UniProtKB/Swiss-Prot annotation, chain B:
It catalyses: TSAVLQ-|-SGFRK-NH2 and SGVTFQ-|-GKFKK the two peptides corresponding to the two self-cleavage sites of the SARS 3C-like proteinase are the two most reactive peptide substrates. The enzyme exhibits a strong preference for substrates containing Gln at P1 position and Leu at P2 position. Inhibited by pyridone-containing alpha-ketoamides compounds 13a and 13b. In turn, alpha-ketoamide 13b (tert-butyl (1-((S)-1-(((S)-4-(benzylamino)-3,4-dioxo-1-((S)-2-oxopyrrolidin-3-yl)butan-2-yl)amino)-3-cyclopropyl-1-oxopropan-2-yl)-2-oxo-1,2-dihydropyridin-3-yl)carbamate) inhibits SARS-CoV-2 replication in human lung cells. Inhibited ex vivo by michael acceptor inhibitor N3. Inhibited ex vivo by compound 11a and 11b. Changing residue 140 to A: Does not affect ability to cleave and inactivate human TRMT1. The chain holds residues 3266 to 3566 of 4405 of the full protein. It comes from Severe acute respiratory syndrome coronavirus 2 (2019-nCoV). Residues 1-301 are cytoplasmic. This is 3C-like proteinase nsp5. It comes from the Viruses. The active site is at residues 39, 143.
């Protein structure tokens, strides 16, 4: 049972390089617009305390160098939408897929295509954490890499990468330029809210463990939804709603384990610990598989 | 530190579907040849005990339905090479990347593009285990999905998927049709052998830890390679080869920790355990990152 990303090719054909001065990062080229993080306009010194509207008014179209592979795209217009810059170019991208911009909910997952200098580097799956950070793998020059999901050849872009917090987690925006979380695109010490664990995802993953034949954590105890939620809150787990119970329906029907029965197992896991044992090869309870991710891989 | 697959676009453009009878699986379309598992020619009853040479004699070019999407590619020739079928088609794939076929060693990792009906579905990173299985995610119809690495726009194909063993792990061939491990493409009682831990990759993981400042496990001991190999096997760890010592060269140089010093550090971990501390925030020693994977992730390769 593996974390599985979507095939990245439809996104690869959209990645370009954007340079302003000596600051270079990635952009997303859809039709005749390139989307990229607005801090491309900052000198490394500007990033310490930027006034973006002031910085942007001092730029012309010619200050932006957009490279698609070896070919330069002429910038014929620019505007800022929140923390994203939209560069109108003189060429429409022939590989533009059917796409949508979506803002995802905490606990949902997406694939990241990490890129450097407009060139794709690697692909992996992330979840939007409850504190609105992601546990990614990004280095210098990765900004403008995007997160996405793919549904019947439609790419739903949900994340553009902007920054790494001192704890090593990552923060970014939707494609309208609005940050996930209480962060700002300024080079200054920033911390996230205390994180919490995505309960419905842990349950989905326990169902995956049972499907794959691992049942040592199961029990005969029972719990009500409210009593489970009291324990979840005590252990910094997110509340489980009735909608989550409904969403876990198919996995519950497939394994014959009632949702509240799996909740009772999780409650004892939180209260007893894992006694050094593992589940699906993991020494910790995994919360980055949604119920959808689990069904898509088991079914 | 996380499992990063290669971008899959160059491989997606090569995936087709191959049907013989009612059996559909995936094929790899490079230039004017489609490569696929030979059991596409079997009926469900055939797979229980197939004679591939005679079953292939009873097939002709016009028995093979090869489709890119729903577009049929006319088959103009067929041959069998080990457990792969090679179907010559009348159209050269314009999306063919620069490519090589390679046979990998246990411990080496690769990206898998899981496909169904010729349509790519997902991508993930896999390590070839010492017992010649991969811990993959493959459902019905996944056969012919491929594994690959990339280096500077050259795709090295190393795996084609054929089967699932009862423990849930997966087995297949190189692109010349030779199985990894003792497996055969027959629906017969087969089982994965006992597995071992990939020592060279654990060591790479230890170097990755050191690079990030997590180095409590660096001890004052060293060892010889032969002494280490003999002890590691008592802990179900693979012995190191000379090639393993050399592939750890770059990480040894970057950290200044000699390979045999790191072997001595790992030996102490095996002999005394962790003692309730973690490495890279884990109580388990990870063995599915190669030394190249560590450098690839810590650098910005393409
Ligand atoms: C870690 C760094 C301290 C230097 C800083 N972080 C914080 O200032 C914080 F603490 F507020 F997060 C930070 O990320 N940036 C500083 C400057 C941009 C951003 C930045 O360099 N983005 C990179 C885009 N190519 C991706 C980074 C590089 C390392 N890994 C990544 O993911 C902006 C906020 C404008
Ligand atoms: C698990 C199955 C019992 C049915 C059987 N296994 C064993 O007979 C073993 F136990 F010996 F391995 C087995 O896999 N096959 C039987 C028959 C081919 C192969 C097969 O169906 N391949 C599928 C290709 N599309 C991929 C499979 C589907 C499930 N998950 C996968 O990956 C061949 C060996 C010729």
């Amino acid at each position: 049972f593996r974390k599985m990303a979507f095939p990245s090719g439809k996104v690869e054909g959209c990645m370009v390089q954007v340079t302003c001065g000596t600051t270079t990062l990635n952009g997303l080229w859809l039709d005749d617009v390139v989307y990229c993080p607005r801090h491309v306009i900052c000198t490394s010194e500007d990033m310490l305390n930027p006034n973006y509207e002031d910085l942007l008014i001092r730029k012309s179209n010619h200050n932006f160098l957009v490279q698609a592979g070896n070919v330069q795209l002429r910038v014929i217009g620019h505007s800022m939408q929140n923390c994203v810059l939209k560069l109108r170019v003189d060429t429409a991208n022939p590989k533009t897929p059917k796409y949508k911009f979506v803002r995802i909910q905490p606990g949902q997952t997406f694939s990241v295509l990490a890129c450097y200098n407009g060139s794709p580097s690697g692909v992996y799956q992330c979840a939007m954490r409850p504190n609105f950070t992601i546990k990614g793998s990004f280095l210098n020059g990765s900004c403008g890499s995007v997160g996405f999901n793919i549904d019947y050849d439609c790419v739903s872009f949900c994340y553009m990468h902007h920054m790494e917090l001192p704890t090593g987690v990552h923060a970014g925006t939707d494609l309208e330029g609005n940050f996930y979380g209480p962060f700002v695109d300024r080079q200054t010490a920033q911390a996230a809210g205390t994180d919490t664990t995505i309960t419905v995802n842990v349950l989905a993953w326990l169902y995956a463990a049972v499907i794959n034949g691992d049942r040592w954590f199961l029990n005969r105890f029972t719990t009500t939804l409210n009593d489970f939620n009291l324990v979840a809150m005590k252990y910094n787990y997110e509340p489980l709603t009735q909608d989550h119970v409904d969403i876990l329906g198919p996995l519950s029907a497939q394994t014959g384990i009632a949702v509240l029965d799996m909740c009772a197992s999780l409650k004892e896991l939180l209260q007893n610990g894992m006694n050094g044992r593992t589940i699906l090869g993991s020494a910790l309870l995994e919360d980055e598989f949604t119920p959808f991710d689990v069904v898509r891989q088991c079914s």
